[PDB]
Design a protein around this ligand. Structure first.
Ligand SMILES: *[C@@H]1O[C@H](CO)[C@@H](O)[C@H](O[C@@H]2O[C@@H](C)[C@@H](O)[C@@H](O)[C@@H]2O)[C@H]1NC(C)=O
Ligand SMILES: *[C@@H]1O[C@H](CO)[C@@H](O)[C@H](O[C@@H]2O[C@@H](C)[C@@H](O)[C@@H](O)[C@@H]2O)[C@H]1NC(C)=O
Ligand SMILES: CC(=O)N[C@H]1[C@H]([C@H](O)[C@H](O)CO)OC(C(=O)O)=C[C@@H]1NC(=N)N
Ligand SMILES: CC(=O)N[C@H]1[C@H]([C@H](O)[C@H](O)CO)OC(C(=O)O)=C[C@@H]1NC(=N)N
Ligand SMILES: CC(=O)N[C@H]1[C@H]([C@H](O)[C@H](O)CO)OC(C(=O)O)=C[C@@H]1NC(=N)N
Ligand SMILES: CC(=O)N[C@H]1[C@H]([C@H](O)[C@H](O)CO)OC(C(=O)O)=C[C@@H]1NC(=N)N
Ligand SMILES: *[C@@H]1O[C@H](CO)[C@@H](O)[C@H](O)[C@H]1NC(C)=O
Ligand SMILES: *[C@@H]1O[C@H](CO)[C@@H](O)[C@H](O)[C@H]1NC(C)=O
Ligand SMILES: [Ca+2]
Ligand SMILES: [Ca+2]
Ligand SMILES: [Ca+2]
Ligand SMILES: [Ca+2]
Ligand SMILES: [Ca+2]
Ligand SMILES: [Ca+2]
Ligand SMILES: [Ca+2]
Ligand SMILES: [Ca+2]
Ligand SMILES: [Ca+2]
Lengths: 385, 385, 385, 385
């Protein structure tokens, strides 16, 4: 089976809860990795949670300093969806402080970036065997999606960035076939900033919705065909998607400068000229989560929208979010099912612990009845250590 | 293989012990979930224990407050029969504070209800993929079996309730095929109350024995064919099945009002006009367990019975109980084998720990020699936390 | 595949070490069951360690009182050979304070006895499904091998005892086919005492070597064909096999009364008129272990022997031992391979802990070079609890 | 599938990071074996880490004294590559204080040496069944590779040593088919010393690079064909490979006596007359690790080399290292892929803890971009115990 990736997104009305791992609550007692940057990806047979460990467990002195993003100890590992990530249930994937993974219908591609900030190297594996490497081309923190790559017709596609986090950087699309890079192109995107892209397949092409850490509080997007012919823009809705951001107002199809510096990984799904936006509830901190349906928000700049569905209350911590899909080959449906996950970050810098970790929740789009609620992390901090 | 469900219940003389997980005893030291509402269900290949976690482990501060029935942290998970439920041996099924599950011979159906009390949503999954949702229709704690659904001829069947726990509510039978609701019907049952049904297949139809929390100390039942043509009644025996209940006396084929409010999940198996009743030994607390064979107790109101088999002594805590079956496709027999499980609740509200959890035992009906004994939880409370 | 059981024992010169689980050393820190009565049994594909848990882990207060033999919490479980028995790696088999198990080439038979001392019941399972029960016929601690049953030509065979531990009791051979008892016979053995038989297949028949707890310091044996036509005797060698026992001297083909009361489970392998005897090194305590080849010891009463191979030094604790075989279907050999295990008992009554448990070692017979040594338990008692 | 072993080593430019288990960091809180002497070996389907436990876990009193090399508690076990070695994820292989293992395309061979120093016995298993034994022929610590054996065309090959660690000893090549020794030959190697060989297949033959503990600070090598026709020598490069060693200088094709006593297990890969040398960074302690490409270093004695790639900084502890290969049957390539692992030793004798253990990293050779860095153990000693 190679996944064809030729179907369009399923029609949906809302989001049904799919998983909740309670990883941090469980890790108070059990042997659970300190992690961050979790994401879900599926094959034609099953779904897995990928994550970047800190090479350490919760409620242990080695969790000290784990707010830090990059180290030689961080590893990409995976476990079944909805299970707490433990050394006893997790598969080792790669040594990595930035990662992506996806399944083409025949095997798992994993991409794990490690090494020094001035010369990092991405190691590509297919079926767990090294198949390629990509070295930093700007010598400034080579980095990738922290969510699943997108597979169409036997090729998989990702985005990598190298360069400043606070100014113009360099962005490339990669086409990968059985773990080997077969094509790449650099985005000609002066005045754009792309990080941590959430990319999905749709009708034989790929759409990515990303993070502008330089000067945009709306999200940049890039779409492309299998030949890497691409288009770029920003989501136009005045329902701004990044964190931090301004209050909702008049949007732009270029970067919205107000509160544009810094950011958070996120995602959106385009339906025609409309968009499903996942975002924090706070404009200033990584708190709460909600899904908003804006029926003209892909291309129009008003702040009007039609549906809001609560996911995490504003009084609870949230974190990264990302898209994942379930292909027809897995579901038996005739359309591409859209899903998403949310990372619930606990500890530093917002809480007075020695450590930082995240738990996860996930949802899938359905055309049937759903409900808003809050499904927060629920851990009681600090722990014994 | 779809399970035919066309066989009748095996002839039996008593109950042989099948499993004991010692979960709470083990959780004094190991990494074991805080749970409640466990149940067993089987495929044509194996048997599994399902349970509602509290998103926390025993002997940890996150076990605090786990007497509480519903939260966003509760998840439906499963592990092999007889094993302690741990994050290291348990599969994630759904986010849920009320659940059911069953296997049609081809795949697992799980039903997990989460969300707010005034608008809960049941998420149905088949082979782990969301296939349907059902929203609360009375906006008052949508809830289901907390035991296995029943499968006959490629369709599976369950009961859901919505409305008051202390007055007339609404009860629906659902027919589900590959995880999609294909038919439903509301019971016309004024003056009845149905919760937490224990439902089994028998001769191409389904029988459910349930809990009347409003005003019955005997148990209500509902039977139906594959078209959802149904019959309703209460078990007539004066050997009253609920907890609490009066002393044994003259029964009724409608609800016995004496000590009828409140209740406990339980089960019974009909054989002709007779009945095997599983019940607590105490009339006032969730203590002890016994099986009673009353050869005319399905339809006649006397308090006489023929056989009593001890399962848990009255000096030890019991809890919920439920039916499960082993189909011919699993056992190789020419009849449907009846079995049952018992939840052994420890902690709150009867013990003044910070937590509540349960362990489990199970038995299967045999036409061979058996013995009464007591197989209680055996944990020594409190733990370290 | 049904195992034919038609081959004869392989020629051997000594014993090569096969496994060591270090269970108690590991259980000082890790989550390891308190156990006793471990044994190994194999299929045509793999070997497993079976054991009777105490429903509790080491280094925990529930290990208190575990010198006690029988309780409702004890369960028969299994794990891979050489692994520490944990809730995270062990399969649940049956509720049991006495047990046997074996594989016929198509599936696992397990026999688990639980219930009260005056009316215990053995539950037989095949492929994990209950297939028969056997109730106590003397109402005095129905009990079985605590080692593997023997399979020949699609039937499996075991021995059960009911009656006094210090006087004449009742002994039956059982023939079991796909978990159903198809034949049984009571041994006509006045003045014999049979407990805890170690039984192996050989040339289409079965040989069992057992424990006389009444009045023999040599071991009783019983051999039989597939029709349960049997012969009985005691091992004649003056190299006495039980513990306690006298110093080596003149043996008997009936029970040797000197130091005959009490005993230990053990085994021996007959080769022609010779015997391989496994025994403790101490005559008075369960200490040390050795294998002795006595080339005429099956039928002759002298105390001469030709080979001794050290297994555990006399300064270290030993415990039960038992035979297991590896059939041609597993090994590819043209003969039946003899193997044995030893239980290394720690704690009560010899050591001042609240608990009793055992670890295990095992060996297989080879016709190649071997060496004597000591492979003791190695745990440092007491633990924190 | 038998692995042909007929391909030559892949062309490479450097080493891409393959795994990092963080075992000791994880064992600060989790249940992780005390180990040493880890090594990786692969089949046509997967890669596994093998290791010698001390029959004890980290952060527990039974870790006391584990600097000691040989005991009856040490066992050869295996787990998936990159996972912490735990009793909950590790398969038991053999009882062993010296070992090797490898897969011939059809099944796993394991070799585990246990017993006394004056008469140790190697137990050979194929698919987990004992297939042969080899006894000590010099009665002085029979010992083997502590890394994978090499398989070519259905036979597997290893080196064993018996005799002094500080003078002339005896060295044998063994040929093994389905776990049975089918041929052996003693090396005629007066004035050489061979221990702990790292052996790989290349073009239908085997090359081993070993440790001279007697009087060489360069490494000895032995190559042979399937008939065990052999050649011997020492690596000629003045880039000395052992630890301890003198500063780089003029090499020798025989043993370099300067600082020749003592040593460390290591490896090298021959390409034409050149060599890839893995070595510690320190000349005096087991600190740091680097890969050096010396394009004439197999046969020429100068100290010039072309490429140095950092692996572990000199400020951090390293340890043993060894070769492993990935065959074409696993990778789908047309050449034999060279890889290596490094053991990162913590505790005694360099740190004053009660215990000694190791974690591991591994790399594979690629003809694509790579980078030098440091991926050290990272644990913060001491632990709680
Ligand atoms: C333990 O559970 C109980 C309910 O059984 C909670 O009330 C406790 O919550 C704590 O105390 C209350 C009064 C309130 O201050 C709340 O915010 C606290 O969290 C709970 N204990 C803890 C420590 O969470
Ligand atoms: C810890 O290991 C050391 C070796 O590194 C042992 O000597 C200790 O053994 C104990 O002390 C010695 C002197 C002797 O009394 C012995 O019998 C003791 O066991 C060991 N410590 C412990 C507690 O086993
Ligand atoms: C590679 C790397 O360190 N990426 C960072 C990321 C990054 O700093 C910003 O996008 C700015 O470039 O931000 C964050 C973040 O929480 O904002 C986490 C990521 N951490 C990890 N992936 N480890
Ligand atoms: C959905 C829900 O909360 N169901 C309750 C159930 C319920 O309160 C009564 O049946 C009255 O309606 O009672 C009990 C109970 O122990 O009596 C446990 C259940 N808990 C859980 N399933 N979580
Ligand atoms: C069924 C039962 O309790 N069997 C006992 C056994 C028995 O007491 C003697 O054989 C005398 O009959 O002795 C021992 C023993 O250590 O001697 C352990 C066994 N314990 C267990 N199998 N649980
Ligand atoms: C069999 C044995 O004990 N081998 C030793 C090895 C050996 O002492 C030297 O090579 C000298 O002969 O050295 C070392 C070592 O760290 O140098 C570890 C090995 N330990 C183990 N394999 N257990
Ligand atoms: C914990 O981490 C902080 C931040 O890097 C460091 O400065 C501090 O020394 C650490 N504490 C210990 C005991 O290692
Ligand atoms: C431990 O077991 C003994 C022996 O049965 C018992 O008498 C004692 O009370 C126990 N201790 C505790 C605290 O349960
Ligand atoms: Ca921004
Ligand atoms: Ca709009
Ligand atoms: Ca009631
Ligand atoms: Ca009656
Ligand atoms: Ca005796
Ligand atoms: Ca003799
Ligand atoms: Ca623990
Ligand atoms: Ca040397
Ligand atoms: Ca050179």
């Amino acid at each position: 089976v190679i996944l064809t990736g030729n179907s369009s997104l399923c029609p949906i009305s809302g989001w049904a809860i799919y998983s909740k791992d309670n990883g941090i609550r469980i890790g108070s007692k059990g042997d659970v990795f300190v992690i961050r940057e979790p994401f879900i990806s599926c094959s034609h047979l099953e779904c897995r949670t990928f994550f970047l460990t800190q090479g350490a467990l919760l409620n242990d002195k080695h969790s000290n300093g784990t707010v830090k993003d990059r180290s030689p100890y961080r590893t990409l590992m995976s476990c079944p969806v909805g299970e707490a990530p433990s050394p006893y249930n997790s598969r080792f994937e790669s040594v990595a402080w930035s990662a992506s993974a996806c399944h083409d219908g025949m095997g798992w591609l994993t991409i794990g970036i490690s090494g020094p900030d001035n010369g990092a190297v991405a190691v590509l594996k297919y079926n767990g065997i090294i198949t390629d490497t990509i070295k930093s081309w700007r010598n400034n923190i080579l980095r990738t999606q922290e969510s699943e790559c997108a597979c169409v017709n036997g090729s998989c596609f990702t985005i990598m960035t190298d360069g400043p986090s606070n100014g113009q950087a360099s962005y490339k699309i990669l086409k990968i076939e059985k773990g080997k890079v077969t094509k790449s192109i650099e985005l000609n995107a002066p005045n754009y900033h792309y990080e941590e892209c959430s990319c999905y397949p749709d009708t034989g092409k790929v759409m990515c919705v990303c993070r502008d850490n330089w000067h945009g509080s709306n999200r940049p997007w890039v779409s492309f065909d299998q030949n890497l012919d691409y288009q770029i823009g920003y989501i136009c809705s005045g329902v701004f998607g990044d964190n931090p951001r301004p209050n909702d107002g008049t949007g732009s199809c270029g970067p919205v400068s107000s509160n544009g510096a810094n950011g958070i990984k996120g995602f959106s799904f385009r339906y025609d000229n409309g968009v499903w936006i996942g975002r924090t509830k706070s404009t200033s901190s990584r708190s709460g989560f909600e899904m908003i349906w804006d029926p003209n928000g892909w291309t129009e700049t008003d702040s009007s929208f039609s549906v809001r569905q609560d996911i995490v209350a504003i009084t609870d911590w949230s974190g990264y979010s990302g898209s994942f899909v379930q292909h027809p080959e897995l579901t038996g449906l005739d359309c591409m099912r859209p899903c998403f996950w949310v990372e619930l970050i606990r500890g530093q810098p917002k809480e007075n612990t020695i450590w930082t970790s995240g738990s996860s929740i996930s949802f899938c789009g359905v055309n049937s009845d759903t409900v808003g609620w809050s499904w927060p992390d629920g851990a009681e901090l600090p722990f014994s250590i």
